[PDB]
Amino acid sequence: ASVTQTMKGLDIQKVAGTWYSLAMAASDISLLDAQSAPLRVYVEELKPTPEGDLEILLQKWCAQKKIIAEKTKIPAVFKIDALNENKVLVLDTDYKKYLLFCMENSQSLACQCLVRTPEVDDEALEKFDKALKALPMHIRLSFNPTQLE
Amino acid sequence: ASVTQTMKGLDIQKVAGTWYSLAMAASDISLLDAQSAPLRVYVEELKPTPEGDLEILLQKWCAQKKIIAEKTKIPAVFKIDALNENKVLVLDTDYKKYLLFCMENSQSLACQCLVRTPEVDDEALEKFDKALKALPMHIRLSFNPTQLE
Questions:
Q1: Has the keyword Repeat been applied to this entry (chains A, B)?
Q2: Which domains does chain A show, CATH number per domain?
């Protein structure tokens, strides 16, 4: 992906709190085509620190995971400093309703559409679809309302 | 789905021969979100009979399967008479390049875009995307050129 695509003027503090993963897309099928695929994870909560890092509460196959994404020089880009280099890229958010982001396997690329509340609305899903057009995506997933919880 | 969506004036004889599954979509994630999901099958060959039925050579997880789809009153709609009622619905084809079809769990619905040859072209993928707009699809899959074989 390009920095052109990442978010401008992100305030990390305002993304705090509860989120729900409404849809996912990935550049290769293997990343999402099974409950136990490595990036088939559901964001539960986001928690900025006072130091500007991003704590991420995930659900996997479900287990609770916690990962820390440290800030980098580029804003809206965060580094999950595990053994295998993974970046978190925030593409866009209005903070109060939706948040789009991707994960890069520093090649592969999985993105998500996050919503604050399962409120009936499709701004997120529209804006997400409109951002994925510019990226190569080979698998694409949307969760119905019984899938949320 | 509706009969409005199925193909008009299908000649079953002209779909004979080799095909490749370039993309799949389904109404529920579970139908395709794993190599061993029940409708994660790849058409290898189609073989009309002189009696107007449709033999279907599939690849699964890969194993070779063979299933017979018998003709019904509605043309372009075929019945896979197994224990669990499954219909095959041909939505459209020009015979010489693409073929779109769905499978119904008489509720659930998985469709595919089939091409004659991995020839670089995107009529099939365009016409497929344009037919899926009218159907509820929650998982969506496209195969790159190393995935074909």
A1: no
A2: 1-149 (2.40.128.20)
